[PDB]
């Protein structure tokens, strides 16, 4: 039922925004139709993990009848805030990554009647909607300020991780806006240390810490959990989640994934890249430097081939195990003083551990 | 003084942001050097009208204590950059959307040598985040904080809305449908003055004229002291005028002065010139228009320039400028009545606008 009560609030939100545009920004039906379409296409079709997580946390920590109602509603609004937030970032990211499809559909900036210049702004509109909806729905909620403050923080950190991502293939020593530079040749920066930094900031926060946090804020139970642990967890699961993202972008068929991979082509500092490099021989690495970051598909097949022949699947399974170990412990360590939360966190994990997509 | 105090705060702001990243965002010195450069390039070199307007207003009110003055003036500086940083965010993104080549004497951000088009997009995002980061850090204990952010974001929102009206102004809006592809309008039935006035109102008037005046009133804590109604008419009127000026320069002002190269004609933009010409152009002229508008072809572009001359647009301009200079004068006097200090600051801003050179 949460999925349907969530979609229910979506209509509620879409109605407000769209009608507000027609009534106070004197927008035309044509463009109202466009934004409705834009909204549904960029915000729907995902796994809704972030949004559904918020609702779960809220529900779980429920401890009147009108309250439960209000709370669950507030959760739905927050969920869409995060959902609208990822929407804003996927739009821009696909433009930044030159991706082809998203959620079994052409990337927004790829749709025929959508131009790149407009997609960039359509993305901007998404980010404003996160505020417009929070303000309108939480105008009276005392937790409004704190909520937005945290939201912008996470948003800001994600934009920082993105910077790390989109520049990992450039020797930072030479990184000078005034002087042009080619993709790194030595890859001397493709380290797990550097990899851990990208992932932590570009994904962990908004994908894991934020949904959890927003649930505690709307349930007004924030001060009841061991944040220090809760974050450790979020940082951990987030890293994992992103490592999966990387692996699928290389080995999970789009028909299944919903998106065509671009890392190898984009010369990204992925999990596969840093792991391979750290364990590969000079011969293997020379070949890598000869086929990585190339659109040419037979070269991508070379890279893909190289990874398989270095047993990355072994490293992966090993990593995934070490993670499951710590996650298990931290959740218990958390369950002690926060049974309900620990439970929702454990749930969020179920949606994570060995996901297919 | 104004500029020196403004620049003073800038370095202070650049110091907080860049250091927070270093210490709390696990950032390296290389990427900190970059962001500092990105900040100085995207936020500096402009005319600083929006920013300095906050300060001017703030001061004009100072006298409605030596410590207050020091705080009100500082808060005005912070809000001043919030707008400059927001202006910077939209300029980076717009230069991409408009495929422009130069900005403030240098190449557009996304056209800098070590700045890739996709990174520039994100750098733009960083620009907008900073506005929030600086406000939250300097105004944490200010009671006006919420109201302040609320107003800022709505204006941020409206601008993005104006951007939508501008970026799709050359497309048959009835065909607007993500699924189906479509070409540039060929009949131009939408290049109307009403449509032009809407684009400008939202994409510019608010963040270039209303916001600066409001932020100043807020940090002055004089917001309720002025006729908001009149204040809005002024902003909307001055805002539209400022944009019309922007469009005219886009086509006739030399890049050398303007600081940027024009792209409206080649971008098939619904500019003030296009709508005015179309409104007074004879069939013969309109047809030659449709055949030379919307192409990078240097020769075609030179034709549109000539066509505008032929229609005596400068004549249309002088008139518009006059009618606007008219009402602006009146409205300021309505203000002066209940708000002399604010009306004065408004006049200053109008001084920075009227017959601007760039
Ligand atoms: O699966 P993708 O490619 O959409 C990705 O995970 C999206 N994404 C992830 C994190 C932050 C972001 F702004 C965007 P990537 O980082 O581009 O690989
Ligand atoms: O001189 P330009 O071309 O940079 C412009 O005035 C910028 N600009 C103006 C208003 C809003 C905006 F986001 C961006 P234009 O509208 O693209 O002509
Ligand atoms: C953060 C990240 C890996 C981006 C993709 O996130 P996701 O796979 O959860 O996104 P959706 O399920 O919303 O499309
Ligand atoms: C017309 C417009 C809002 C964009 C250019 O604004 P502006 O000329 O005030 O910008 P700068 O002086 O900041 O470069
Ligand atoms: Mg990415
Ligand atoms: Mg991507
Ligand atoms: Mg990916
Ligand atoms: Mg432009
Ligand atoms: Mg534009
Ligand atoms: Mg212009």
mmCIF file of C-alpha atoms in Angstrom, chain A residues 16-17 20-21 24-28 30-31 33-35 37-38 88-89 92 95-97 108 111-118 120-122 124-125 127-129 131-132 135 139 144-145 149 152-153 155-160 162-164 166-181 189 197 200-201, chain B residues 17 20-21 24-28 30-31 33-35 37-38 41 89-90 93 96-98 109 112-116 118-119 121-123 125-126 128-130 132-133 136 140 145-146 149-150 153-154 156-161 163-165 167-171 173-182 190 198 201-202 206:
data_model
loop_
_atom_site.group_PDB
_atom_site.id
_atom_site.type_symbol
_atom_site.label_atom_id
_atom_site.label_comp_id
_atom_site.label_asym_id
_atom_site.label_seq_id
_atom_site.Cartn_x
_atom_site.Cartn_y
_atom_site.Cartn_z
ATOM 1 C CA UNK A 16 -0.079 22.087 -6.926
ATOM 2 C CA UNK A 17 3.062 22.880 -8.903
ATOM 3 C CA UNK A 20 0.644 27.279 -9.460
ATOM 4 C CA UNK A 21 2.490 27.784 -12.734
ATOM 5 C CA UNK A 24 1.034 32.733 -10.822
ATOM 6 C CA UNK A 25 3.532 32.422 -13.680
ATOM 7 C CA UNK A 26 0.835 32.649 -16.342
ATOM 8 C CA UNK A 27 2.042 29.579 -18.170
ATOM 9 C CA UNK A 28 0.261 28.205 -21.228
ATOM 10 C CA UNK A 30 1.134 23.690 -23.989
ATOM 11 C CA UNK A 31 4.030 24.273 -21.604
ATOM 12 C CA UNK A 33 1.585 19.783 -20.594
ATOM 13 C CA UNK A 34 5.322 19.731 -21.302
ATOM 14 C CA UNK A 35 6.290 20.053 -17.631
ATOM 15 C CA UNK A 37 5.333 15.120 -19.152
ATOM 16 C CA UNK A 38 8.813 16.203 -18.104
ATOM 17 C CA UNK A 88 17.373 16.683 -11.219
ATOM 18 C CA UNK A 89 20.721 14.935 -10.990
ATOM 19 C CA UNK A 92 22.094 16.656 -15.840
ATOM 20 C CA UNK A 95 24.032 15.072 -20.310
ATOM 21 C CA UNK A 96 27.338 15.119 -18.463
ATOM 22 C CA UNK A 97 27.906 11.407 -19.140
ATOM 23 C CA UNK A 108 15.541 13.052 -21.191
ATOM 24 C CA UNK A 111 13.714 12.756 -26.434
ATOM 25 C CA UNK A 112 12.936 14.258 -29.886
ATOM 26 C CA UNK A 113 11.052 17.406 -28.838
ATOM 27 C CA UNK A 114 13.576 18.015 -26.072
ATOM 28 C CA UNK A 115 16.733 19.984 -26.888
ATOM 29 C CA UNK A 116 19.928 19.960 -24.816
ATOM 30 C CA UNK A 117 19.649 23.621 -23.885
ATOM 31 C CA UNK A 118 16.125 23.012 -22.611
ATOM 32 C CA UNK A 120 19.628 21.663 -18.795
ATOM 33 C CA UNK A 121 16.942 24.041 -17.560
ATOM 34 C CA UNK A 122 14.292 21.354 -17.217
ATOM 35 C CA UNK A 124 17.017 23.248 -12.981
ATOM 36 C CA UNK A 125 13.231 23.314 -12.648
ATOM 37 C CA UNK A 127 15.598 21.217 -8.232
ATOM 38 C CA UNK A 128 13.385 24.235 -7.567
ATOM 39 C CA UNK A 129 10.347 21.978 -7.284
ATOM 40 C CA UNK A 131 11.822 23.540 -2.472
ATOM 41 C CA UNK A 132 8.501 24.722 -3.831
ATOM 42 C CA UNK A 135 7.662 25.211 1.482
ATOM 43 C CA UNK A 139 5.068 25.976 5.830
ATOM 44 C CA UNK A 144 11.013 23.101 8.188
ATOM 45 C CA UNK A 145 14.233 25.093 8.536
ATOM 46 C CA UNK A 149 19.234 23.045 5.849
ATOM 47 C CA UNK A 152 20.783 21.630 0.824
ATOM 48 C CA UNK A 153 23.818 20.232 2.588
ATOM 49 C CA UNK A 155 22.483 18.380 -2.310
ATOM 50 C CA UNK A 156 25.651 20.442 -2.145
ATOM 51 C CA UNK A 157 27.778 17.398 -1.283
ATOM 52 C CA UNK A 158 26.402 15.461 -4.235
ATOM 53 C CA UNK A 159 27.335 18.300 -6.594
ATOM 54 C CA UNK A 160 30.805 18.036 -5.067
ATOM 55 C CA UNK A 162 30.004 14.933 -9.221
ATOM 56 C CA UNK A 163 32.939 17.282 -9.548
ATOM 57 C CA UNK A 164 35.173 14.468 -8.329
ATOM 58 C CA UNK A 166 33.728 14.230 -13.891
ATOM 59 C CA UNK A 167 37.376 15.073 -13.229
ATOM 60 C CA UNK A 168 38.804 11.753 -12.087
ATOM 61 C CA UNK A 169 40.112 11.142 -15.617
ATOM 62 C CA UNK A 170 42.176 14.352 -15.548
ATOM 63 C CA UNK A 171 45.541 14.654 -13.776
ATOM 64 C CA UNK A 172 44.568 17.213 -11.109
ATOM 65 C CA UNK A 173 48.130 18.524 -10.950
ATOM 66 C CA UNK A 174 47.636 19.975 -14.432
ATOM 67 C CA UNK A 175 43.954 20.781 -13.855
ATOM 68 C CA UNK A 176 43.999 24.427 -14.963
ATOM 69 C CA UNK A 177 40.839 26.009 -16.466
ATOM 70 C CA UNK A 178 43.025 28.290 -18.560
ATOM 71 C CA UNK A 179 45.066 25.458 -20.066
ATOM 72 C CA UNK A 180 43.725 22.482 -22.032
ATOM 73 C CA UNK A 181 44.689 18.930 -20.975
ATOM 74 C CA UNK A 189 44.874 8.764 -9.664
ATOM 75 C CA UNK A 197 35.904 9.799 -2.165
ATOM 76 C CA UNK A 200 30.939 8.745 -0.748
ATOM 77 C CA UNK A 201 30.031 12.296 -1.766
ATOM 78 C CA UNK B 17 33.542 28.011 1.229
ATOM 79 C CA UNK B 20 34.985 24.138 4.418
ATOM 80 C CA UNK B 21 35.495 21.962 1.335
ATOM 81 C CA UNK B 24 34.927 18.859 5.709
ATOM 82 C CA UNK B 25 34.568 17.712 2.101
ATOM 83 C CA UNK B 26 37.838 15.828 1.887
ATOM 84 C CA UNK B 27 38.919 18.001 -1.037
ATOM 85 C CA UNK B 28 42.423 18.234 -2.480
ATOM 86 C CA UNK B 30 44.206 20.949 -6.881
ATOM 87 C CA UNK B 31 40.421 21.005 -6.982
ATOM 88 C CA UNK B 33 42.603 25.943 -6.829
ATOM 89 C CA UNK B 34 40.121 25.147 -9.591
ATOM 90 C CA UNK B 35 36.989 26.112 -7.675
ATOM 91 C CA UNK B 37 39.440 30.104 -10.206
ATOM 92 C CA UNK B 38 35.931 29.055 -11.240
ATOM 93 C CA UNK B 41 35.818 33.856 -13.217
ATOM 94 C CA UNK B 89 25.001 30.210 -11.930
ATOM 95 C CA UNK B 90 22.538 31.265 -14.608
ATOM 96 C CA UNK B 93 24.212 27.519 -17.751
ATOM 97 C CA UNK B 96 25.736 26.739 -22.766
ATOM 98 C CA UNK B 97 22.042 26.785 -23.631
ATOM 99 C CA UNK B 98 22.619 29.752 -25.947
ATOM 100 C CA UNK B 109 33.045 29.330 -18.800
ATOM 101 C CA UNK B 112 37.651 27.719 -21.209
ATOM 102 C CA UNK B 113 40.554 25.420 -22.226
ATOM 103 C CA UNK B 114 40.589 23.071 -19.180
ATOM 104 C CA UNK B 115 36.865 23.361 -18.591
ATOM 105 C CA UNK B 116 34.872 20.608 -20.268
ATOM 106 C CA UNK B 118 29.981 18.656 -18.866
ATOM 107 C CA UNK B 119 32.014 19.927 -15.920
ATOM 108 C CA UNK B 121 27.365 22.254 -16.198
ATOM 109 C CA UNK B 122 28.142 20.976 -12.704
ATOM 110 C CA UNK B 123 30.350 23.947 -11.816
ATOM 111 C CA UNK B 125 25.399 23.678 -9.954
ATOM 112 C CA UNK B 126 28.127 24.374 -7.401
ATOM 113 C CA UNK B 128 23.865 27.821 -6.840
ATOM 114 C CA UNK B 129 24.693 25.648 -3.847
ATOM 115 C CA UNK B 130 27.169 28.221 -2.574
ATOM 116 C CA UNK B 132 22.714 28.635 0.186
ATOM 117 C CA UNK B 133 25.897 27.699 1.971
ATOM 118 C CA UNK B 136 23.134 29.566 6.118
ATOM 119 C CA UNK B 140 22.114 31.307 10.960
ATOM 120 C CA UNK B 145 16.658 33.859 7.564
ATOM 121 C CA UNK B 146 13.632 31.798 6.532
ATOM 122 C CA UNK B 149 15.618 32.093 1.716
ATOM 123 C CA UNK B 150 11.974 31.658 0.805
ATOM 124 C CA UNK B 153 14.218 30.578 -3.977
ATOM 125 C CA UNK B 154 10.933 31.711 -5.462
ATOM 126 C CA UNK B 156 15.346 31.512 -8.347
ATOM 127 C CA UNK B 157 12.395 29.389 -9.403
ATOM 128 C CA UNK B 158 10.754 32.113 -11.509
ATOM 129 C CA UNK B 159 14.000 32.789 -13.371
ATOM 130 C CA UNK B 160 14.282 29.117 -14.351
ATOM 131 C CA UNK B 161 10.684 29.473 -15.528
ATOM 132 C CA UNK B 163 14.480 30.413 -19.021
ATOM 133 C CA UNK B 164 11.919 27.909 -20.226
ATOM 134 C CA UNK B 165 9.927 30.604 -22.008
ATOM 135 C CA UNK B 167 14.693 28.560 -24.630
ATOM 136 C CA UNK B 168 11.509 27.357 -26.368
ATOM 137 C CA UNK B 169 10.314 30.677 -27.774
ATOM 138 C CA UNK B 170 11.242 29.663 -31.324
ATOM 139 C CA UNK B 171 9.226 26.441 -31.337
ATOM 140 C CA UNK B 173 4.387 25.442 -28.718
ATOM 141 C CA UNK B 174 1.390 23.454 -29.942
ATOM 142 C CA UNK B 175 3.940 20.910 -31.121
ATOM 143 C CA UNK B 176 5.690 20.919 -27.760
ATOM 144 C CA UNK B 177 5.857 17.215 -26.985
ATOM 145 C CA UNK B 178 9.015 15.417 -25.794
ATOM 146 C CA UNK B 179 8.168 12.341 -27.878
ATOM 147 C CA UNK B 180 7.871 14.039 -31.261
ATOM 148 C CA UNK B 181 10.775 16.030 -32.717
ATOM 149 C CA UNK B 182 10.065 19.378 -34.395
ATOM 150 C CA UNK B 190 4.302 33.483 -31.535
ATOM 151 C CA UNK B 198 6.413 37.305 -20.400
ATOM 152 C CA UNK B 201 9.417 39.482 -16.819
ATOM 153 C CA UNK B 202 10.289 36.025 -15.464
ATOM 154 C CA UNK B 206 12.738 39.442 -10.729
#
